[PDB]
Amino acid sequence: KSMQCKVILLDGSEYTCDVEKRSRGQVLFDKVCEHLNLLEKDYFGLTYRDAENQKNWLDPAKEIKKQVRSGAWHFSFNVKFYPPDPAQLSEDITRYYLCLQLRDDIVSGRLPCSFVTLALLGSYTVQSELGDYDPDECGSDYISEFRFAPNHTKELEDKVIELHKSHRGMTPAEAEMHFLENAKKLSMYGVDLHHAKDSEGVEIMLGVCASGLLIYRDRLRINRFAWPKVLKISYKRNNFYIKIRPGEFEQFESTIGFKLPNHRAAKRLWKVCVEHHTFFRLL
Numbered sequence: 001k002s003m004q005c006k007v008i009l010l011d012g013s014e015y016t017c018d019v020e021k022r023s024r025g026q027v028l029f030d031k032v033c034e035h036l037n038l039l040e041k042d043y044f045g046l047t048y049r050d051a052e053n054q055k056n057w058l059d060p061a062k063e064i065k066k067q068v069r070s071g072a073w074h075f076s077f078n079v080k081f082y083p084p085d086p087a088q089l090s091e092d093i094t095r096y097y098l099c100l101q102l103r104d105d106i107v108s109g110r111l112p113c114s115f116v117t118l119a120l121l122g123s124y125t126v127q128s129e130l131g132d133y134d135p136d137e138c139g140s141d142y143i144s145e146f147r148f149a150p151n152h153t154k155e156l157e158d159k160v161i162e163l164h165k166s167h168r169g170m171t172p173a174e175a176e177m178h179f180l181e182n183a184k185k186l187s188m189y190g191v192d193l194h195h196a197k198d199s200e201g202v203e204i205m206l207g208v209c210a211s212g213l214l215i216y217r218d219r220l221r222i223n224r225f226a227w228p229k230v231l232k233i234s235y236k237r238n239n240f241y242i243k244i245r246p247g248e249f250e251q252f253e254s255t256i257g258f259k260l261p262n263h264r265a266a267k268r269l270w271k272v273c274v275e276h277h278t279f280f281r282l283l
Helices: 025-035 093-109 115-130 153-165 172-183 263-283
Strands: 002-008 016-020 044-049 056-057 073-079 192-197 203-208 210-215 222-226 232-236 241-243 254-259
Touching: 002 025, 016 025, 016 263, 025 073, 073 093, 093 172, 115 153, 115 172, 153 222, 192 263, 203 254, 203 263, 232 263, 241 263
Parallel strands: 002 073
Antiparallel strands: 002 016, 044 056, 044 073, 192 203, 192 254, 203 210, 210 222, 232 241, 241 254
16 A cells, blocks of 8 residues: 655665655655654755656655656655755754755755865864864864865865864854855855756756846856746746846836756746745745
8 A cells, every 4th residue: 555765864864664655745755854853844855856867856735656657766855945044943953954955065066165165164064073173082084084075185174174173162053053154155055056048049057046046157147036026937838937027117027038958847947936936935
């Protein structure tokens, strides 16, 4: 009567459970959040890979079986909605899971940042995980197992140690809050990037986030539409559309369109925009 599910958690461990063959995604998500003692679960979600090898969010309202065709019900637990101000979350654990996601976002290269910031972020991770710097625990070797960046240098390793020394007395909660104050201001913080083409076939990326819909060309942010200004989000076939009122007095409506690689891509973008629009209105 049941299906085994496997979920990769943010610390790299794996959660296994069984659900009924006709369960909605909510059943599995609730089990995972329970396992994690996670109360502020609306910021999080589960992703799977479809038959094209594309990442998709599992829709909690729909049967798992309609979404994951394969019986390989294998998911990843991730941050879905990155809070714009993590200090306003109710629980330290929520912030801890957010930090685990952000460390991965940094190490994988998905959240770029400056050497200076990488080193400061690292130093908070180290203070959180290891506590106070101490010569009798802290040899030259003591952080060779942390990854602080996509590419590791010794100049980075040395600056992390220097900044760690300065944090003496900081509790893990304070260290995590500083980590998050710094991360939340990074330009790509919480931005879900999608390949698309504009009206003149030029290759761009569209980024979905709490602030709005962002447009990049050549690693350069060239536009931004805040969600309150976005009046309609729709798709048709391989195309995604937003409706706005341009101009100083908003006297007319304009629909801007983007070409994605296929209907599935346009539908995924559309869904992730609509969910973000909704979430960050109600927040």
